[PDB]
Ligand binder design. Structure first.
Ligand SMILES: COc1cccc(Cl)c1CC(=O)N1C[C@H](C(N)=O)[C@H]2CCC[C@H]21
Ligand SMILES: [Zn+2]
Length: 139
């Protein structure tokens, strides 16, 4: 689990979104596993606007943060789940690191701010949904 709170928005994995998230829907994209809902309180997370390929993510299944090198956002094949059939998930970045399904929502940050959230993993890899291209999160 986990979310990004920026301005009047809450960013979460689309497969983990609540009934309240869907009742206050701003934007969702099944191909990215993202959903953004509106909030009453003012969020203070800073979104990174950069092309960093190094950062640190939070891994709940180890209660630890890990430094990682990660790939550029791209279309990557993802196994079927209770939420999606087998498909290419877009805007995804892979890194070598530990992850388990419940790790989804963990934040990946670089020196500029929030880069994305854990969305996929398996076999010593972890995949992050990018949020740096969503320029409107700041306006
Ligand atoms: C961090 O996730 C894992 C880590 C290790 C192993 C495994 Cl199988 C996972 C889960 C995982 O890959 N996915 C990818 C899905 C997707 N984004 O399409 C998500 C929906 C429900 C399962 C989630
Ligand atoms: Zn950066």
């Amino acid at each position: 689990s986990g979310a990004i709170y920026v301005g009047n928005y809450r960013v979460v994995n689309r497969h983990l979104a609540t009934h309240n998230d869907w009742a206050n829907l701003v934007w969702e994209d099944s191909s990215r596993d993202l959903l953004v809902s509106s909030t009453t309180a003012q969020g203070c997370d800073t979104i990174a606007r950069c092309d960093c390929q190094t950062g640190v993510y939070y891994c709940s299944s180890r209660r630890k943060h890990y430094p990682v090198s990660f790939s550029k956002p791209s279309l990557i094949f993802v196994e079927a789940s209770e939420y999606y059939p087998a498909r290419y998930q877009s805007h995804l970045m892979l890194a070598v690191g530990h992850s388990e399904p419940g790790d989804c929502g963990g934040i990946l940050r670089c020196q500029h701010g929030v880069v994305g959230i854990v969305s996929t993993g398996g076999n010593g890899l972890v995949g992050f949904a990018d949020v740096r291209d969503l320029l409107w999160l700041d306006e």
